[PDB]
């Protein structure tokens, strides 16, 4: 089940960590980017939609499927205050 998440980055940034990526599989066979910690009262947390275990599919139509950890991190660090996430739930 794919969902849309729209965020406003805060003073602690977006408020979550990721893993995975081509060459850094978080789950064997799966090169995807996964959300691994949602941080207390950060942006992601206040909004409430994003969940530990969520696959990230996109950020601002920069595509996060089959990319490297650092390609994903780059794209997520290269964001304004306005952040759109497309995710797939388990």
């Amino acid at each position: 089940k794919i969902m849309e998440i729209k965020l406003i980055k805060g003073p602690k940034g977006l408020g979550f960590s990721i893993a995975g990526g081509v060459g850094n599989q978080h789950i064997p066979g799966d090169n995807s980017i996964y959300v691994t910690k949602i941080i207390e009262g950060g942006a992601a947390h206040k909004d409430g939609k994003l969940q530990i275990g969520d696959k990230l599919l996109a950020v601002n139509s920069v595509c996060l499927e089959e990319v490297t950890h650092e390609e994903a991190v780059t794209a997520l660090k290269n964001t304004s205050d306005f952040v759109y996430l497309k995710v797939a739930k388990p």
Binding site: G13, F16, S17, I18, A19, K37, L76
Partner: peptide, 4 residues
């Protein structure tokens, strides 16, 4: 993992 990478904090964002």
């Amino acid at each position: 993992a990478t904090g964002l």
